[PDB]
Amino acid sequence: GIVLFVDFDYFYAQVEEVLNPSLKGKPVVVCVFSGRFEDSGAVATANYEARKFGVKAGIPIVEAKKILPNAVYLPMRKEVYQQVSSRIMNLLREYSEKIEIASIDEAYLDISDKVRDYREAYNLGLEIKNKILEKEKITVTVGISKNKVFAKIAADMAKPNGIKVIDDEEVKRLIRELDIADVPGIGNITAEKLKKLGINKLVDTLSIEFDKLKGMIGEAKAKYLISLARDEYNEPIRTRVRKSIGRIVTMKRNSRNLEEIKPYLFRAIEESYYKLDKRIPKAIHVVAVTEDLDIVSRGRTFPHGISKETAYSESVKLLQKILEEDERKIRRIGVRFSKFI
DNA sequence: GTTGGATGGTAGG
DNA sequence: CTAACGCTACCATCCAAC
Numbered sequence: 239g240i241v242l243f244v245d246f247d248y249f250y251a252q253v254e255e256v257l258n259p260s261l262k263g264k265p266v267v268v269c270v271f272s273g274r275f276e277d278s279g280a281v282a283t284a285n286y287e288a289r290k291f292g293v294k295a296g297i298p299i300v301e302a303k304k305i306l307p308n309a310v311y312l313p314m315r316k317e318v319y320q321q322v323s324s325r326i327m328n329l330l331r332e333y334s335e336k337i338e339i340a341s342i343d344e345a346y347l348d349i350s351d352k353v354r355d356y357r358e359a360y361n362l363g364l365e366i367k368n369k370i371l372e373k374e375k376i377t378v379t380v381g382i383s384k385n386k387v388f389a390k391i392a393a394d395m396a397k398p399n400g401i402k403v404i405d406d407e408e409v410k411r412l413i414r415e416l417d418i419a420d421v422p423g424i425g426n427i428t429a430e431k432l433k434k435l436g437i438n439k440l441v442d443t444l445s446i447e448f449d450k451l452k453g454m455i456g457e458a459k460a461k462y463l464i465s466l467a468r469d470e471y472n473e474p475i476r477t478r479v480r481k482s483i484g485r486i487v488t489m490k491r492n493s494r495n496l497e498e499i500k501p502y503l504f505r506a507i508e509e510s511y512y513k514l515d516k517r518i519p520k521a522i523h524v525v526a527v528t529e530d531l532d533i534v535s536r537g538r539t540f541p542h543g544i545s546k547e548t549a550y551s552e553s554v555k556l557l558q559k560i561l562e563e564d565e566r567k568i569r570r571i572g573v574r575f576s577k578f579i
Numbered sequence: 580g581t582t583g584g585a586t587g588g589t590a591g592g
Numbered sequence: 593c594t595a596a597c598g599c600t601a602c603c604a605t606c607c608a609a610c
């Protein structure tokens with residue numbers, strides 16, 4: 239069984255680099271402008287030139303302009319990026335019809351049926367890597383191993399524009415010495431509530447009885463982490479089904495004025511239904527982001543699917559339900575649809 | 580004594 | 593306006609309703 243994994247390199251930035259190659263070789267930042275004030279919003283990504291100086295997805299745009307004033311700052315055009323993602327995901331279908339899209343910029347292939355061993359799997363990476371670069375001028379990073387998780391770790395090890403094979407043998411080696419915070423699924427919170435025990439390697443979980451870990455990071459995470467170390471984890475490439483669609487926007491000013499919020503919430507509803515096209519949801523949730531950036535929400539699941547008009551009415555009640563029970567002023571407002579028929 | 584809905588925690592692109 | 597986007601998926605915890 240062989241999984242080959244692909245993740246494009248600083249995607250949104252790279253795409254923009256492709257459309258304006260003069261940018262190439264100098265710092266580039268792609269931003270999500272909120273509209274609150276000039277430069278309000280966060281970074282969605284930045285090229286490696288920009289990263290040297292501290293500019294990465296997630297930081298406030300002011301921190302970045304502060305820290306890297308003379309760089310290109312471009313507005314995010316997700317839609318344009320999605321075409322390029324789509325056209326690349328089509329190529330990956332050439333090499334394998336068993337493909338799992340994981341994000342806008344990555345995907346796993348099952349190539350157990352195309353190649354015979356890691357050596358040929360490696361050669362395939364080179365072809366896959368070269369087709370994309372010929373038909374889209376986009377470099378990408380390939381990881382190759384015995385399953386999703388390790389194929390993803392190998393990719394992370396080789397970024398950017400790399401290619402790494404993790405063999406039955408080197409898997410032994412990492413399960414033993416790979417830091418625990420570098421395992422997919424393990425973030426700050428956990429990998430700090432892990433050093434709590436003395437677990438530092440994927441291997442150190444085998445050294446603490448189930449019981450203790452179970453009630454420290456939860457049933458699903460424990461079962462998962464242990465089967466990795468014990469080396470029995472095996473999830474198949476499965477086609478993912480979008481399970482929810484949403485929209486959330488930031489308001490010019492914080493409000494508790496229902497009449498002032500409503501327009502924003504209605505904006506969020508129109509663009510979700512467009513975004514739904516055809517799919518019928520039975521569930522709605524209004525999501526509010528508050529002054530202090532706590533995220534609060536109220537939902538409702540219906541017996542039968544929710545029409546656009548039903549959603550206008552329902553969301554409003556839910557907003558009120560939120561206004562009734564949170565004292566804080568609202569800063570961002572949004573909506574999410576789910577439980578699709 | 581499941582389950583499954585409501586709200587939130589955590590991770591990640 | 594005076595910093596912290598916008599998405600999504602999976603899981604944990606609670607409590608009613610069966």
Ligand SMILES: Nc1nc2c(ncn2[C@H]2C[C@H](O)[C@@H](COP(=O)(O)OP(=O)(O)OP(=O)(O)O)O2)c(=O)[nH]1
Binds near residue numbers: 245248
């Ligand atoms: N709005 C927004 N978009 C993000 C965020 N993180 C990632 N993205 C988008 C923009 C990225 O180009 C794209 C791919 O993200 P990746 O996690 O794979 O990193 P990226 O490709 O940008 O650089 P690379 O993988 O790290 O070396 O997803 C984020 O926090 N916010």
Ligand SMILES: [Ca+2]
Binds near residue numbers: 246343344
């Ligand atoms: Ca990625």
Ligand SMILES: [Ca+2]
Binds near residue numbers: 248
């Ligand atoms: Ca990437």
Ligand SMILES: [Ca+2]
Binds near residue numbers: 420
């Ligand atoms: Ca981590």
